Amino acid sequence: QKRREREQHIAECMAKMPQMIVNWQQQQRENWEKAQADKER
Amino acid sequence: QDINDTVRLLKEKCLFTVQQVTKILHSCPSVLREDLGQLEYKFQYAYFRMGIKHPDIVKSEYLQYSLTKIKQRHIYLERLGRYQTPDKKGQTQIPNPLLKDILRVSEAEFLARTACTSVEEFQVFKKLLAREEEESE
Amino acid sequence: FPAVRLALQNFDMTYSVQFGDLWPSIRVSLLSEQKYGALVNNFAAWDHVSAKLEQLSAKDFVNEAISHWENLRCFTFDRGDISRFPPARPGSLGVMEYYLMDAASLLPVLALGLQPGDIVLDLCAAPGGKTLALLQTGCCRNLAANDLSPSRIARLQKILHSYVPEEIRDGNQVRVTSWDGRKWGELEGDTYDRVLVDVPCTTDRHSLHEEENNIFKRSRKKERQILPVLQVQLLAAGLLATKPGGHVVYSTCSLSHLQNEYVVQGAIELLANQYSIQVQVEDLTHFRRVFMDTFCFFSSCQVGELVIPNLMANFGPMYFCKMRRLT
Amino acid sequence: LTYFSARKGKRKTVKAVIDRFLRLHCGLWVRRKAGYKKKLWKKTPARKKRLREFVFCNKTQSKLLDKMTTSFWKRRNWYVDDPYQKYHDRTNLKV
Amino acid sequence: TVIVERWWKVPLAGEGRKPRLHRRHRVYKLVEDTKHRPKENLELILTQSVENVGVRGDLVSVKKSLGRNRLLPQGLAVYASPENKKLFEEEKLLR
Amino acid sequence: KNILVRMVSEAGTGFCFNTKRNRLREKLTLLHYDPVVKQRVLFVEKKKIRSL
RNA sequence: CCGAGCCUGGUGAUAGCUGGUUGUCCAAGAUAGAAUCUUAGUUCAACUUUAAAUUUGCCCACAGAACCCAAAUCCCCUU
RNA sequence: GCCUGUUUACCAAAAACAUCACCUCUAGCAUCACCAGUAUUAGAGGCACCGCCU
RNA sequence: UUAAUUUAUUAAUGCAAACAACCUGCAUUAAAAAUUUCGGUUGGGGCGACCUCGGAGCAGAACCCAACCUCCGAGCAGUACAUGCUAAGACUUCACCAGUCAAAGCGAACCUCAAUUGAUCCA
């Protein structure tokens, strides 16, 4: 039971992982863009 | 038990004679309401930092006043240079102002006659000292 | 045996004579909390940080000074307010939003008045503060910050990393060195249009507060005694380095007439005799009047200006003297 | 150590040795590297890998440990799934 | 009653042998003082009417102080033993 | 100064590793290799281990 | 024979300190450091001794060992 | 150092210790000391007779 | 003794226990004491300084060595988040402890420089 709970939790996290990584990288890039926009003023 | 422990603090931990304790109770009844620990701190403030001996602490009703006022005025004078704690020999470069001149007098009289400073500066110092006490605690 | 108490004894026995009735107020101000100013990082989101500080109810003493003077922004609380600025935090641009530094420490740089594109020297100023203010100013023709202490050089480097962008610091715009200012006259002469000489001093407030490495400790008696000679040598080196017609500002974090006015006068005399170079002390009385509303000044000063620490404005102590090298 | 106990007259074992070292029947003593659990955040990966290893002891160290432990710890132990069963004996050793 | 416990475990003595104690086995820690336990109640069977407790032959949980100081000494109550319970049961069923 | 913080795998595994970040800086989210999942995954700062 | 009496016992107290440590004869046998409440001591190393296994040990020809800007040393085939 | 006295038996007899006098602190009290006593009392201690000026 | 550790003992109080006091248990506060210690270098004394690590005088040229001394610095910071796992063979501060470099391989992509530190036990 514990083994399958761990496996299914890992499966759900992995399923969410690509979208989460894409969102995180997009957030970093947009923060960088906002910094450049502030520099432009 | 409250009365007995107040008296025992005044006698054993403050080394006030029996007659001195009776006179303290007669002149400053608020000491009874005042909690232990705070009273000892007030007495030791008078004794060590201010260099006031038991006869003077009793003659001038020092325990009547509040610790906040005592610390405010005394530390203000000390940092101004007017007051100076007696050395190991019990001597000071300049005679210290009288306890009556510090505590008994009103705020304006204390600031003019003794401190010779401005009420604005005194208020700033009071706020600063309150903040310092809060940080220390 | 507290070196703090030693410093108190010395400061009493000297400054009481020096200032008469002002010594009690100066003493209480020095022994009380120090009022801090927030110099907004011009490289960071300066406008946003200034708005946040104004919401925190501070005001730009530099801005109000420039208002009646007829590029720096440091916010300070009103007279009598003891409020503390919130600790500075990194901004969006990866640099700290503002620097918490003594407001009076900014006056030397403001008096130096860096013209657009001036080559600048900081002979021994490496505690941060004035150096960062100079960087935020328009000294785009390079700034040479020298100190004799690698520890303070490392601290300066860390603050520059935190505040000044690497793009600004990469070029020769900033040159940080761990050398001796006295040798600096020989190393470079008639080079810098603007020079700031913040000599080591008694640092009255720090000596009174910090026990560690207190200048008034017994073990450092020789250094304390020779301090005037070292300060004169450093100021002479800075005056030698500055270009003819160039401006220097000698700054000291102490009340000592000996360490401020006699130091500047001895530097002038030594430079005019040994090296035959004339220097004229500029008039900072207009500066005093302009900045009086925020800082309390010792009216009885011969050469230079002296911000004295008051309770209503615990920004001192800070002596600064402006000197133009006529020859 | 105690060369003759007061109750049995036997030689005693320093249990501090048992709690720290493994003896291979061949005569080698294995140990962990000191500080392998300390402040790993400031240690490089190579240093951590070096610290995480099981290490043999000197000849003099092994002699000291043999003296400090009794014969019971120097016997053949046929444990079921001992990870060190292969290491309990030497092979192709010349002198 | 004060209940104590050895700090140091005593080695097993055997079956017929007696444990051999030493200086360290005389060191104790107080596990519990029974006098500080919460009060319980004593079961009694009343023999005479008593105010605010009962009338006669009814089991009553009374404070131990009351049971041992007034009721039992004065005979107003008897212990709730099986024999007394049986006897008062016959009394009730005969009444 | 800097603080040592425990970045925890967001892949659901109990994997964790310690990093250093400025106290004043915002909490940390970081791609890191997860040996259990055998893949780079996000890690999020959970708690401050110590201050250094 | 008192800054803590005397006697007995624990007690053969402990002492990194002082002193002592008894037949004959032969043989090998000398200054490198490190840690240590450690420098009056000890543990490791080095050196020394004994026994055993094996094969290379020493001396050393060329060649070779850094820029910043003497004497020699290491390494080393032969012998 | 007030005095007469006391002291390191066995290297110090003193300016040291005590001492009347004065001063400080503590205690409102019975059947074993204090005491078969009771604040002009008892205990703890300082100093050193007395006498003066402030 | 304002050195460390204790309150075993007395005196108080507080809470339980028991029916105000006494006694017992547990706490707190004092008095009284009890056990134990008083590191190293710097002719002594005072005030100081120093004790670990890195660099120079400094071995002229493999390594190591000039202690005491003259000094100058470090008790980090920055980047990165594969700064992951493994593994031949080597170096090593003259011991050990510890500290270094690293082929190949798996898996990925296609550290920095003087010192910047601390064992066991135990949490």
Ligand SMILES: Nc1nc2c(ncn2[C@@H]2O[C@H](COP(=O)(O)OP(=O)(O)OP(=O)(O)O)[C@@H](O)[C@H]2O)c(=O)[nH]1
């Ligand atoms: N590894 C490690 N052990 C510690 C540390 N602090 C204390 N210890 C352990 O505890 C011992 C020191 O005890 P204490 O000096 O009383 O420690 P403390 O933290 O000052 O105080 P307590 O918590 O009251 O023990 C060490 O020898 C270790 O066993 C620490 O920072 N690191």
Ligand SMILES: [Mg+2]
């Ligand atoms: Mg048996």
Ligand SMILES: [Mg+2]
């Ligand atoms: Mg005798």
Ligand SMILES: [Mg+2]
């Ligand atoms: Mg012996």
Ligand SMILES: [Mg+2]
């Ligand atoms: Mg021979």
Ligand SMILES: [Mg+2]
């Ligand atoms: Mg010794």
Ligand SMILES: [Mg+2]
């Ligand atoms: Mg006499």
Ligand SMILES: [Mg+2]
């Ligand atoms: Mg006589």
Ligand SMILES: [Mg+2]
């Ligand atoms: Mg006698």
Ligand SMILES: [Mg+2]
């Ligand atoms: Mg005699």
Ligand SMILES: [Mg+2]
């Ligand atoms: Mg005689």
Ligand SMILES: [Mg+2]
């Ligand atoms: Mg080695």
